[PDB]
Design an enzyme around this catalytic site. Structure first.
Site, PDB file in Angstrom:
ATOM      1  N   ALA A  65      11.865   2.882 -32.745  1.00  0.00           N
ATOM      2  CA  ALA A  65      10.937   3.646 -33.561  1.00  0.00           C
ATOM      3  C   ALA A  65      11.727   4.672 -34.367  1.00  0.00           C
ATOM      4  CB  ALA A  65       9.876   4.295 -32.692  1.00  0.00           C
ATOM      5  N   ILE A  66      12.207   4.218 -35.516  1.00  0.00           N
ATOM      6  CA  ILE A  66      13.140   4.951 -36.364  1.00  0.00           C
ATOM      7  C   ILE A  66      12.404   5.342 -37.632  1.00  0.00           C
ATOM      8  CG2 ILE A  66      15.326   4.758 -37.642  1.00  0.00           C
ATOM      9  CD1 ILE A  66      15.688   4.798 -34.624  1.00  0.00           C
ATOM     10  N   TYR A  69       8.427   4.901 -38.407  1.00  0.00           N
ATOM     11  CA  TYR A  69       7.857   4.013 -37.393  1.00  0.00           C
ATOM     12  C   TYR A  69       7.592   4.700 -36.064  1.00  0.00           C
ATOM     13  CZ  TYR A  69       8.439  -0.236 -40.245  1.00  0.00           C
ATOM     14  OH  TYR A  69       8.336  -1.230 -41.199  1.00  0.00           O
ATOM     15  N   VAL A 149       7.789  -2.490 -32.837  1.00  0.00           N
ATOM     16  CA  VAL A 149       6.900  -1.366 -32.480  1.00  0.00           C
ATOM     17  C   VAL A 149       5.570  -1.351 -33.232  1.00  0.00           C
ATOM     18  CG1 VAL A 149       7.701   0.377 -34.165  1.00  0.00           C
ATOM     19  CG2 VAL A 149       6.944   1.081 -31.850  1.00  0.00           C
ATOM     20  N   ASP A 150       5.519  -2.006 -34.390  1.00  0.00           N
ATOM     21  CA  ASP A 150       4.329  -1.969 -35.262  1.00  0.00           C
ATOM     22  C   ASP A 150       3.287  -2.972 -34.797  1.00  0.00           C
ATOM     23  OD1 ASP A 150       6.110  -4.054 -36.199  1.00  0.00           O
ATOM     24  OD2 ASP A 150       5.366  -3.688 -38.271  1.00  0.00           O
ATOM     25  N   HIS A 170       6.695 -18.180 -34.058  1.00  0.00           N
ATOM     26  CA  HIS A 170       6.223 -17.335 -35.156  1.00  0.00           C
ATOM     27  C   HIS A 170       4.809 -17.772 -35.548  1.00  0.00           C
ATOM     28  CE1 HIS A 170       6.120 -15.540 -39.172  1.00  0.00           C
ATOM     29  NE2 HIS A 170       7.337 -15.048 -39.031  1.00  0.00           N
ATOM     30  N   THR A 182      11.706 -21.178 -42.636  1.00  0.00           N
ATOM     31  CA  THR A 182      12.536 -20.298 -43.477  1.00  0.00           C
ATOM     32  C   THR A 182      13.824 -19.907 -42.763  1.00  0.00           C
ATOM     33  OG1 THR A 182      11.353 -18.308 -42.746  1.00  0.00           O
ATOM     34  CG2 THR A 182      10.556 -19.399 -44.741  1.00  0.00           C
ATOM     35  N   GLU A 240      16.310 -12.074 -37.519  1.00  0.00           N
ATOM     36  CA  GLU A 240      15.505 -13.242 -37.180  1.00  0.00           C
ATOM     37  C   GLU A 240      16.200 -14.558 -37.504  1.00  0.00           C
ATOM     38  OE1 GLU A 240      11.065 -13.410 -37.439  1.00  0.00           O
ATOM     39  OE2 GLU A 240      11.574 -14.420 -39.352  1.00  0.00           O
ATOM     40  N   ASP A 263      -0.914 -12.060 -36.074  1.00  0.00           N
ATOM     41  CA  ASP A 263      -1.411 -11.151 -37.089  1.00  0.00           C
ATOM     42  C   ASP A 263      -2.801 -11.624 -37.495  1.00  0.00           C
ATOM     43  OD1 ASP A 263      -2.121  -9.772 -39.425  1.00  0.00           O
ATOM     44  OD2 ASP A 263      -0.034  -9.468 -40.000  1.00  0.00           O
TER      45      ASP A 263
HETATM   46  O1  LIG Z   1      12.213   2.093 -40.812  1.00  0.00           O
HETATM   47  C1  LIG Z   1      12.170   1.308 -39.821  1.00  0.00           C
HETATM   48  C2  LIG Z   1      12.200  -0.070 -39.994  1.00  0.00           C
HETATM   49  C3  LIG Z   1      12.167  -0.891 -38.866  1.00  0.00           C
HETATM   50  N1  LIG Z   1      12.072  -0.362 -37.615  1.00  0.00           N
HETATM   51  C4  LIG Z   1      12.049  -1.175 -36.388  1.00  0.00           C
HETATM   52  O2  LIG Z   1      12.363  -2.535 -36.705  1.00  0.00           O
HETATM   53  C5  LIG Z   1      11.234  -3.362 -36.415  1.00  0.00           C
HETATM   54  C6  LIG Z   1      11.204  -4.489 -37.423  1.00  0.00           C
HETATM   55  O3  LIG Z   1      10.770  -4.018 -38.706  1.00  0.00           O
HETATM   56  P1  LIG Z   1       9.335  -4.386 -39.256  1.00  0.00           P
HETATM   57  O4  LIG Z   1       9.078  -3.534 -40.460  1.00  0.00           O
HETATM   58  O5  LIG Z   1       8.343  -4.374 -38.114  1.00  0.00           O
HETATM   59  O6  LIG Z   1       9.601  -5.886 -39.768  1.00  0.00           O
HETATM   60  P2  LIG Z   1       8.539  -7.033 -40.054  1.00  0.00           P
HETATM   61  O7  LIG Z   1       8.568  -7.444 -41.514  1.00  0.00           O
HETATM   62  O8  LIG Z   1       7.192  -6.647 -39.491  1.00  0.00           O
HETATM   63  O9  LIG Z   1       9.079  -8.168 -39.175  1.00  0.00           O
HETATM   64  C7  LIG Z   1      10.097  -9.049 -39.648  1.00  0.00           C
HETATM   65  O10 LIG Z   1      11.328  -8.365 -39.652  1.00  0.00           O
HETATM   66  C8  LIG Z   1      11.764  -7.959 -38.343  1.00  0.00           C
HETATM   67  C9  LIG Z   1      13.121  -7.322 -38.578  1.00  0.00           C
HETATM   68  O11 LIG Z   1      14.003  -8.241 -39.237  1.00  0.00           O
HETATM   69  C10 LIG Z   1      11.755  -9.078 -37.301  1.00  0.00           C
HETATM   70  O12 LIG Z   1      11.830  -8.520 -35.958  1.00  0.00           O
HETATM   71  C11 LIG Z   1      10.450  -9.852 -37.352  1.00  0.00           C
HETATM   72  O13 LIG Z   1      10.492 -11.022 -36.553  1.00  0.00           O
HETATM   73  C12 LIG Z   1      10.136 -10.280 -38.772  1.00  0.00           C
HETATM   74  O14 LIG Z   1       8.861 -10.906 -38.816  1.00  0.00           O
HETATM   75  C13 LIG Z   1      10.061  -2.381 -36.418  1.00  0.00           C
HETATM   76  O15 LIG Z   1       8.885  -2.858 -35.751  1.00  0.00           O
HETATM   77  C14 LIG Z   1      10.664  -1.187 -35.739  1.00  0.00           C
HETATM   78  O16 LIG Z   1      10.727  -1.412 -34.324  1.00  0.00           O
HETATM   79  C15 LIG Z   1      12.063   1.031 -37.482  1.00  0.00           C
HETATM   80  O17 LIG Z   1      11.971   1.520 -36.341  1.00  0.00           O
HETATM   81  N2  LIG Z   1      12.088   1.812 -38.571  1.00  0.00           N
HETATM   82 MN   LIG Z   2       6.921  -5.819 -37.289  1.00  0.00          MN
END
Ligand SMILES: O=c1ccn([C@@H]2O[C@H](COP(=O)(O)OP(=O)(O)O[C@H]3O[C@H](CO)[C@@H](O)[C@H](O)[C@H]3O)[C@@H](O)[C@H]2O)c(=O)[nH]1
Ligand SMILES: [Mn+2]
Ligand SMILES: O=c1ccn([C@@H]2O[C@H](COP(=O)(O)OP(=O)(O)O[C@H]3O[C@H](CO)[C@@H](O)[C@H](O)[C@H]3O)[C@@H](O)[C@H]2O)c(=O)[nH]1
Ligand SMILES: CCCCCCCCO[C@@H]1O[C@H](CO)[C@H](O)C[C@H]1O[C@@H]1O[C@@H](C)[C@@H](O)[C@@H](O)[C@@H]1O
Ligand SMILES: CCCCCCCCO[C@@H]1O[C@H](CO)[C@H](O)C[C@H]1O[C@@H]1O[C@@H](C)[C@@H](O)[C@@H](O)[C@@H]1O
Ligand SMILES: [Mn+2]
Lengths: 283, 283
Positions: A65-66, A69, A149-150, A170, A182, A240, A263
């Protein structure tokens, strides 16, 4: 503990599994390498809970959680308390650049949370899990579960997932043919998968296994990502893409159905999903 | 080796497993504790052969041929050479009271046979496997497969069966409800199973697993049989009754379908059996 002397199960009364009745006829419930694919209706949670409690299983859950987030942590953790490994020993490891922004969440007995501070800049989670926390995890938990985390838990996520190595189908691609996956398709990337290879498209947002297998995976993915960086290439879907390459070459011992990463806004609630267990939150 | 560092699989071209197509819709292919049930159509043998060869897996096969049952060895061994773990390292352990009656059978490369002499008098196999051969097996093989001799291989029996602990569905009872299972029903026996308990009826003629798990099973069954003897009771189906009690309380990590133990004379060739792999010989 994992793999230690297993005492006898007690007497249990439950429905007899019938050999000439499959529960699920609508989906594949075992991979071609004999790994279960975990769907509702395939497991008796009472049997599994007995087996894992008799080992005093401890599950670690990692979450990052950065920056903005941190806002997702309250719902993530509060719903984990309702639905994630309830009855088992749980250790949450929350990685953040803002320790003071971690919400004070009330935990059930046998559950603990550690706040681990990291630097702020998705792709460096592999490094943190594998390089910085290796000794910690080996000493503290039996299994590691690594998630985005989201998200929120809406239904049971329990010991049915635990195994030496797992990935999650997925939700966007479980019905797709492999040519449409992909995967990284440039031969210059370590994550490269040709159009005639691939079992499944796994999501980076939910994987896990024993501590040893998770450290192997995260180390391999971190090393492959470093090679790509040195060669001036970034895989199409980042961590991924590398996770997918690893799980192609190192078959998971269970595969989680998209019940475990869904989702609803984007994909609704299909008939093949009897439960939506762990779901995307907007943003 | 078991459980040691696993190198990457090579590139392989094979059909994509499709999530919304089960192969087998006519049978249960996973137990309620998430153990695969091994039927034809559930596994890609090329993937499994790769996985097990990359571990240099050695399989031990135990068989007892005492008194007149030495006559069954020639067909048993010659057909094992055609069908059992071909391509893998195999060590046969033939237990007999007549070492000179063991037929001279020509073996494929990487396969060996040891003749172990025992005393002549079905129920003492558990003792020999667990008390006398414990150190031998731990030093020589990764998995043990324990079978009856009055049998022949007709089709592939390979690494798809290998797992920490397996039993085989008895061909007489796979469609039966648990009340009809011929478990030991007297509470005075260690093998006792009440009418409301039981997953499957397993046949004593084909079980196995890792050396550690097979030694655990055979030790437990031997100890339970000794307790029954001291209490003046003999379980209805002898070692098989005890095997069933053990596998009720210690769930197997794979279950073999009746493809793996069949009697065509008694039961024909049902549509649900795509292959008859290992079959009873008359007498
Ligand atoms: O500013 C940020 C950005 C990312 N995260 C962490 O990184 C995760 C991944 O980022 P997110 O924005 O949730 O990516 P998504 O587009 O929802 O998910 C895609 O990207 C992720 C990161 O590549 C992969 O885990 C997933 O499978 C893929 O679907 C987040 O949930 C957080 O846990 C942070 O904490 N802060
Ligand atoms: Mn996500
Ligand atoms: O004089 C004998 C008698 C038995 N055996 C060995 O013991 C095995 C079992 O005896 P068998 O006569 O084959 O028993 P079955 O009636 O065919 O089989 C039942 O009895 C066995 C012993 O209890 C169990 O393994 C089986 O699951 C159960 O179906 C044989 O195959 C041999 O390996 C001998 O070597 N010599
Ligand atoms: C064909 C339709 C696919 C619809 C889902 C696409 O999801 C996206 O897939 C990418 C790989 O191709 C990568 O994993 C990101 C992923 O998008 C994430 O996951 C979705 C399910 C949504 O929650 C989305 O907002 C999120 O960014
Ligand atoms: C209901 C019909 C059942 C028909 C099979 C019965 O098999 C016998 O089952 C016993 C347990 O109830 C025990 O395992 C012995 C078993 O008989 C052995 O296996 C059969 C399949 C035959 O090969 C038979 O000759 C052999 O003795
Ligand atoms: Mn027999």
């Amino acid at each position: 503990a994992i793999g230690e002397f297993m005492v006898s199960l007690p007497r249990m009364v439950y429905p007899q599994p019938k050999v000439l009745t499959p529960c699920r006829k609508d989906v594949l419930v075992v991979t071609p390498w004999l790994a279960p694919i975990v769907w509702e209706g395939t497991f008796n949670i009472d049997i599994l809970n007995e087996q894992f409690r008799l080992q005093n299983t401890t599950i670690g859950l990692t979450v990052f959680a950065i920056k903005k987030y941190v806002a997702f942590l309250k719902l993530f953790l509060e719903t984990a308390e309702k639905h994630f490994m309830v009855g088992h020993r749980v250790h949450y490891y929350v990685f953040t650049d803002q320790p003071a922004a971690v919400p004070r969440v009330t935990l059930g007995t046998g559950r603990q949370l550690s706040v681990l501070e990291v630097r702020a800049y998705s792709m460096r989670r592999m490094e943190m899990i594998s390089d910085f926390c290796e000794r910690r995890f080996l000493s503290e938990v039996d299994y590691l579960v690594c998630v985005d985390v989201d998200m929120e838990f809406r239904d049971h996520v329990g010991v049915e997932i635990l195994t030496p190595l797992f990935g999650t189908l997925h939700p966007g691609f479980y019905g797709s043919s492999r040519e449409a996956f992909t995967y990284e398709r440039r031969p210059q990337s370590q994550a490269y998968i040709p159009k005639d290879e691939g079992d499944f498209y796994y999501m980076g947002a939910f994987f896990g296994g024993s501590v040893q297998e998770v450290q192997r995976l995260t180390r391999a993915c971190h090393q492959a990502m470093m090679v790509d960086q040195a060669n001036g290439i970034e895989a199409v879907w980042h961590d991924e893409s590398h996770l997918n390459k690893y799980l192609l070459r190192h078959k998971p011992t269970k595969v989680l159905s998209p019940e475990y990463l869904w989702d609803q806004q984007l994909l609704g609630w299909p008939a093949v999903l009897r439960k939506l267990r762990f779901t995307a939150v907007p943003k």
